Scaffold this motif. Structure first.
Motif, PDB file in Angstrom:
ATOM      1  N   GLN A   1      -1.804  30.698  24.050  1.00  0.00           N
ATOM      2  CA  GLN A   1      -0.442  30.238  23.835  1.00  0.00           C
ATOM      3  C   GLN A   1      -0.341  28.715  23.796  1.00  0.00           C
TER       4      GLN A   1
ATOM      5  N   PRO B   1       0.120  24.909  23.252  1.00  0.00           N
ATOM      6  CA  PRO B   1       0.707  24.118  22.168  1.00  0.00           C
ATOM      7  C   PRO B   1      -0.367  23.446  21.324  1.00  0.00           C
TER       8      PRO B   1
ATOM      9  N   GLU C   1       8.178  18.820  28.604  1.00  0.00           N
ATOM     10  CA  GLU C   1       7.990  20.043  27.832  1.00  0.00           C
ATOM     11  C   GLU C   1       6.599  20.608  28.051  1.00  0.00           C
ATOM     12  N   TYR C   2       5.598  19.738  28.106  1.00  0.00           N
ATOM     13  CA  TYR C   2       4.235  20.213  28.282  1.00  0.00           C
ATOM     14  C   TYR C   2       3.996  20.767  29.684  1.00  0.00           C
TER      15      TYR C   2
ATOM     16  N   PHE D   1       5.408  24.238  30.003  1.00  0.00           N
ATOM     17  CA  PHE D   1       4.577  25.272  29.393  1.00  0.00           C
ATOM     18  C   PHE D   1       3.612  25.872  30.412  1.00  0.00           C
TER      19      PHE D   1
END
Length: 207
Positions: A133, A135, A168-169, A172
């Motif tokens: 999954q 990024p 955002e990272y 995740f």
């Protein structure tokens, strides 16, 4: 303290154990699928880490390369490994307590369970399909899913000043593995165990 390191993955890994300036026990070993390696870690060890390395080659002197987690080209690690590396982290016998965690702050390569084998505390696990999954910008060609500090080298991702927020990272990693650290100032997922507990580290625990 005793750590039993077990490879339940279908692929070979090269386990590593270091406190950054020295090996723990022999420092590293090949583990084929199903193999177990028991090491002894001296009481009072602060800042120890265990990780897996993937896709390694070593010559008959113990020198070579791994595509994840390489520790300066050595089979028997004295230093920490190159990201991406899922990390089992521990400090033992700190005023009567042991402290353990799993961390994704240096990325993720292999799923992991880190559990006590003695009584008095719980284990932690990160076993989601982070690599599948991952990024696109964090995907490591050699394998694994890098953290954003490794990739982008910004003060926000690396928390250089001691002030940073989630990103955002980091979210995740946190969504897929809530019980592992996802950035430097994450709400701690450290577990407190009785001093002088023993532990098992299992790679690919759901395999």
């Amino acid at each position: 303290a005793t750590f039993e390191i077990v490879n339940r993955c279908s692929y070979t890994v090269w386990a590593a154990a270091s406190k950054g300036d020295a090996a723990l026990d022999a420092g590293g070993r090949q583990l084929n699928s199903g193999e177990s390696w028991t090491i002894n870690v001296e009481p009072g060890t602060k800042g120890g880490k265990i990780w897996a390395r993937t896709d390694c080659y070593f010559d008959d002197s113990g020198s070579g390369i791994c595509k994840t987690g390489d520790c300066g080209g050595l089979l028997r690690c004295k230093r920490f490994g190159r990201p991406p590396t899922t990390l089992a982290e521990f400090s033992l016998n700190q005023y009567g307590k042991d402290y353990i965690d799993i961390s994704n702050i240096k990325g993720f390569n292999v799923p992991m369970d880190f559990s006590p084998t003695t009584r008095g505390c719980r284990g932690v696990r990160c076993a989601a399909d982070i690599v599948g999954q991952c990024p696109a910008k964090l995907k490591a060609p050699g394998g694994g899913c890098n953290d954003a500090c490794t990739v982008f080298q910004t003060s926000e991702y690396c928390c250089t000043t001691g002030k940073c927020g989630p990103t955002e990272y980091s979210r995740f990693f946190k969504r897929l593995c809530p019980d592992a650290f996802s950035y430097v100032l994450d709400k701690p997922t450290t577990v407190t165990c009785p001093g002088s507990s023993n532990y098992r580290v299992t790679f690919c625990p759901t395999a």
